[PDB]
Design a protein around this ligand. Structure first.
Ligand code: CTP
Ligand code: CTP
Ligand code: MG
Ligand code: MG
Ligand code: MG
Ligand code: MG
Lengths: 395, 395
């Protein structure tokens, strides 16, 4: 018994004692078998949501309308699912009926409270061979939930399996069915695919399969995707950095309309382009400017070089480290640090409050930062004063 | 800082550091103030669901569509809710806007990471006085969510507060609006109200208010409800035992159609009647019969006397203890224990398999139980054999 399932063993036990019968199901079994780090432990039972909400103290009702209940056990969250037949939903007592409904074979395994692998679908084979195959006709299943395709391809990104000949085919043939699946749902899938350790050949595949030109803004970029192979994807740390390079390697013009089609939250689509930009503007890592760094702010700066990295081949290590230095020597690091107040500039140049004031301070920080004038009140005063009679001699 | 919030303090802290601002909200504050045992710790913040899913590792998405996110922290489950205005939902930054939307004042409190109570609605007053008052016009709020009434009455059950004159009034005037709220939702509320420590005057109130005759099967039972006052509700330990007595004191004829209207699960409505029945059939605690006990099975037996208790005044203590003895002396306690097999009765009376067989075994347990014949094979054989030539001499 692996500690993953060890603590999770209770869930089963209590479900068995109340005469219910339960199994470990899903990837957790796969990962265990495959020999991956074990993800979410998932548990499937013949006990109805209501029976599970009676047995366990903490019970979160996520969607008792389609089988699942989240059971807080011993300080974790496990997803217990009453066996079902994907028709509304129909609940059975046949575990075999349940496995029978899942996307692919690697997923359709189950292990008993004792540790005996229950594989009525050749999951065990699939894994040794490392192949994503459909549970039943690949055709019928994609008709049963089109999204099942995207993920067949994400799995390729996430595990590094190959697709099954008849399964892959089925995708190109049934490609259209995607436009029927909500964008929201497509995005989360794209966003895991992207973080694959095999992303590199997931994306291309996304193309060789019919799947391209049904996903947001991925019309006819076939060439771009296949090429995407050389990108060091897996050193991208973050979602932004992800979307970031994804754009770049598509060559995507305006990041904003694109990432928005993907129904991504603003804060990403904003910081997305943020970096996409700083990247175009700075073509070289040595070229970062005390101004520019201050402007983008450490975190983003680094993320820039890490995207750059994923494009170049050049390890970001040293740059990250040079930026981290520079940024902690920038005589200020935010605008709020500026020893001098917007009101100070008014009482100083004897003008009414207005538009000029911004431009003033605008050019004061760019002075403090580039080390031109200190960040003390007195000196910035003279600095301002003495640069205003300069703007009289010049015109 | 009370331990409840102590561990929960982290949730706030990390939401503050990422510049977000959060508060403890809800009954947890009420309970703390009131000086009750502290229930669910709840947290409200300006950070959107997505921001909360980014910051914390474990993040359960219960309904990010209306603000709430369940954040698993340090081994518990806390509900973080992005401030909102109950219009679809609109998210703000104003905590004051958030409090302003909640049902009643006791609930509309908030405490900061430091321990400073934030009461912009006189919750603190309401609690000292022990009064359930509406946050704003009692009228408008019941139009905003009719169910708010049921609970204004359950709260009476739960805490032992009185209703505010203008609030109580508003209920009778706006009584009708209930039929618009899903039964499912009414039941859960009734199911808490019933377990109230003040249940006794909650039920009556449920009547003096317009609330009666909008709840399942509670048409015109006004008299029955008011009388319901004398029942020792609070010693009812279980759901069944609850519905059980509720039926009884309403005098409800057929339990089955009634409890079912409440959209209660079967296993309850079944065990519900179960007891309701055993109760009508056995009018006296001394009258339990080795048969009857074996038949209902300890647990339910006790439950029966516990309901009887809630009706009589007589403490179940002794009976429960007498039952628990008798039942562990019953020479068998289930039907599966019977040393004699249905197949044994066939190969013994030389008849084909059929309906008589049940009737045979049926009268064998009742013979093993009442201590008439042993629960060994040999002796039951004889016992059966010698009672079949008895049924020849008799007719
Ligand atoms: N379109 C989908 C998506 C998922 N599943 C099923 O839902 C379970 C859990 O879903 P998921 O979160 O995707 O976990 P796994 O598919 O098991 O793999 P992973 O945990 O890496 O996502 C799986 O066992 C799978 O059979 C499905 O039948 N159809
Ligand atoms: N119809 C409802 C039901 C609940 N609430 C709000 O949702 C929050 C949590 O709901 P609940 O689980 O009922 O907790 P409390 O009302 O605070 O009290 P208790 O924990 O005893 O149920 C509360 O702060 C309350 O203001 C609401 O505004 N309208
Ligand atoms: Mg888990
Ligand atoms: Mg999973
Ligand atoms: Mg809790
Ligand atoms: Mg609560």
């Amino acid at each position: 018994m692996k500690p993953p399932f060890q603590e999770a063993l209770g869930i089963i036990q209590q479900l068995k004692q109340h005469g219910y019968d339960a199994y470990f199901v899903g990837g957790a079994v796969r990962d265990l078998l495959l020999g991956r780090p074990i993800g979410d432990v998932d548990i499937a039972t013949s006990a109805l949501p209501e029976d599970v909400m009676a047995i366990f103290p903490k019970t979160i009702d996520v969607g008792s309308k389609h089988g699942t209940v989240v059971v807080v056990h011993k300080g974790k969250a496990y997803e217990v699912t009453t066996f079902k037949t994907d028709g509304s939903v129909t609940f059975v007592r046949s575990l075999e009926e349940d496995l029978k409904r899942r996307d692919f074979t690697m997923n359709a395994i189950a292990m008993d409270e004792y540790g005996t692998i229950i594989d009525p679908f050749g999951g065990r084979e699939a894994i040794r061979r490392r192949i994503i195959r459909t549970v039943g006709e690949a055709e019928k299943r994609f008709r049963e939930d089109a999204l099942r395709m995207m993920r067949a391809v994400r799995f390729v990104s996430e595990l590094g399996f190959a697709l099954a000949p008849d399964t892959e085919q089925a995708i190109v043939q049934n490609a259209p069915l995607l436009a029927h699946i909500s964008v929201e749902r497509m995005t989360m899938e794209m966003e895991k695919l992207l973080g694959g350790p095999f992303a590199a050949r997931a994306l291309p595949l996304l193309a060789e399969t019919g799947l391209n030109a049904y996903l947001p803004g991925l019309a006819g970029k076939e060439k771009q995707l296949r090429l995407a192979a050389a990108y060091r994807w897996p050193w991208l740390a973050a979602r932004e950095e992800r979307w970031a390079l994804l754009c770049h390697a598509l060559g995507v013009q305006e990041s904003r309309p694109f990432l928005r089609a993907w129904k991504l939250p603003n804060k990403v689509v904003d910081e997305a382009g943020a970096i996409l930009t700083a990247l175009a503007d700075i073509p070289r890592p040595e070229a970062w400017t005390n101004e520019q760094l201050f402007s983008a702010g450490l975190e983003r700066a680094l993320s820039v070089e890490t995207v750059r990295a994923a494009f170049t081949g050049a390890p970001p290590g040293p740059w990250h480290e040079k930026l981290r230095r520079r940024f902690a020597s920038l005589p200020i690091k935010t605008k709020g640090e500026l020893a001098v107040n917007g009101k100070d500039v008014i009482e100083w140049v004897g003008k009414p409050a207005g538009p000029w004031v911004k431009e003033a301070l605008d050019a004061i920080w760019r002075a403090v930062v580039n080390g031109e004038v200190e960040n003390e009140k007195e000196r910035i005063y003279a600095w301002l004063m003495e640069r205003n009679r300069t703007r009289e001699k010049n015109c």
